[PDB]
Design a protein around this ligand. Structure first.
Ligand code: 05J
Length: 261
């Protein structure tokens, strides 16, 4: 076993259909890695194409500060293994639960910090004629030291701008024009998803998957936030979920905004 040899398990940090993720040490280099172990997906299944899209996206992108780093993947005995950088602060989805439990939330400064950082990530990815297509707290990762680095993960849904093979992301974060199968402005669907991601961080109530409250949002109505936020900022989130995707800012656009530091 390459796994049982090259690495040593310190902590289970994920459990589910996919399988299990583990905090591990590379025996060779003594650095910490997140390694995921999955059953070989069914041929012709979305699990497999996800797997397939991630391989390609890893091959193209190489390395970026705001993208969780790919190191390696391989097989043993009808199981996939993927070795990625380990982010010690967990997923934003976790951090938000933590923020429920201590009756805290992300103060506007941190929301702005969050938005811009995941912004630089999308800029790089879009710049490389790719789109992520499943942006959500669950798939944003946090590396702490003080400083905080936000890193985009899970590229199972990454496809080309040119010839888009669209696996529908989480419905809670999905822009209307993607449900309609309009794939002409997918860069602006990542943008849509990032706004709602940020809204979750503000302590918004769990987002609808469907029903009245869902179409309300896609009509450009920002979901209610407990805490109070600046006019400048509130309007930027609002435009990021504009019904017309052309009217949403690009990644490039987003990371050149005074309201952000
Ligand atoms: C290599 C696989 C993907 N993956 C990363 O690339 C990645 C990078 N940093 C990290 N850090 C991390 C560090 C602590 C935790 N928990 C959070 C919950 N706590 C109670 C206990 C500690 C989670 C995550 N996790 C990564 N992954 C990953 C860990 C758990 C899960 C996932 N990913 C999933 O998103 C896999 C689909 C769902 C569960």
């Amino acid at each position: 076993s390459r796994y049982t040899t090259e690495f040593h398990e310190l902590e289970k940090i994920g459990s589910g259909e996919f399988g299990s993720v583990f905090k591990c040490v590379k025996r060779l280099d003594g650095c910490i890695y997140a390694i995921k172990r999955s059953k070989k997906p069914l041929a012709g299944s979305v699990d497999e194409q996800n797997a397939l899209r991630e391989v390609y996206a890893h091959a193209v992108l190489g390395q970026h500060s705001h993208v969780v780093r790919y190191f390696s993947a391989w097989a043993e005995d009808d199981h996939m293994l993927i070795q990625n950088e380990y982010c010690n602060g967990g997923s934003l989805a976790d951090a938000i639960s933590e923020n429920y439990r201590i009756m805290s939330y992300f103060k506007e400064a941190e929301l702005k910090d969050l938005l811009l950082q995941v912004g630089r990530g999308l800029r790089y990815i879009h710049s490389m004629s790719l789109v992520h297509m499943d942006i959500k707290p669950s798939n944003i990762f946090i590396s702490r030291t003080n400083k905080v680095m936000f890193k985009i993960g899970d590229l199972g849904h990454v496809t080309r701008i040119s010839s888009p093979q669209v696996e529908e992301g989480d419905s809670r974060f999905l822009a209307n024009e993607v449900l309609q199968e309009n794939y002409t402005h997918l860069p602006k669907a990542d943008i849509f998803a990032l706004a709602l991601t940020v809204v979750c961080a503000a302590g918004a109530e769990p987002l609808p998957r469907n029903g009245d409250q869902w179409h309300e949002i896609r009509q450009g109505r920002l979901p209610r936030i407990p805490q109070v936020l600046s006019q400048e900022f509130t309007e930027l989130l609002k435009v990021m979920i504009h019904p017309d995707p052309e009217r949403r800012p690009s990644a490039m656009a987003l990371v050149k905004h005074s309201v952000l530091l």
